[PDB]
Amino acid sequence: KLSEEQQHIIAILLDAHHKTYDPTYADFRDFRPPVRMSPLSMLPHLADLVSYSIQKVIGFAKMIPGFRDLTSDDQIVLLKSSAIEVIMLRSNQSFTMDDMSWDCGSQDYKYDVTDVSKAGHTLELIEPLIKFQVGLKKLNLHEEEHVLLMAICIVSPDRPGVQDAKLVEAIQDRLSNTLQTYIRCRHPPPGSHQLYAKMIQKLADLRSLNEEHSKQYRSLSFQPENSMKLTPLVLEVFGN
């Protein structure tokens, strides 16, 4: 029951994700090395991982049908506000409930709670993120649903600063309708039960995660010694 246009949207998003998410994580070797033993030994590595991820999220976003047709200012507002949320979403692909960590192919690139703690985060702030990853992983999303979810997250018409909210909403509605139809037509029960609602709830959960983790970014980067360990792109997109 998926229209020709809806199948096209999905085809475009899958291609976009595949070209911006390398499941082998080969590029991680180019990041400053992780250090597990300034007590924030993992800050350099995770700053590089996040900076790299921001580049990839932008690469994915530019491929969302209609996104590049919004004004440059709105594209910027949408990406600055969704970047950390999309990184959290895309990271679910490497996340494993086996031991509650992000497994990127090797021990050196396997990140757990302690590693994030070594980048400045309090254990209290890390817990909700782990819980979020577990809940998202349990939805067993089809890759089609996963890429649609990331796209919907990016083109959210309510982000403060958006000028042409109606245009952003037009794109999101097309993506939302595509997702709803895909679930009803291609996701078998019981996994499909209230799936759209559960997925959109994850986007609401992400607003809270964004708020708390952004506060942490501001506190950490407020100290010159820590900002010095970040990257130009992180400072530009997240703030400086």
Partner: peptide
């Protein structure tokens, strides 16, 4: 504040 790098990655 301008976002030169972000803008270039969008091109």
């Amino acid at each position: 504040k301008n976002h030169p790098m972000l803008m270039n990655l969008l091109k």
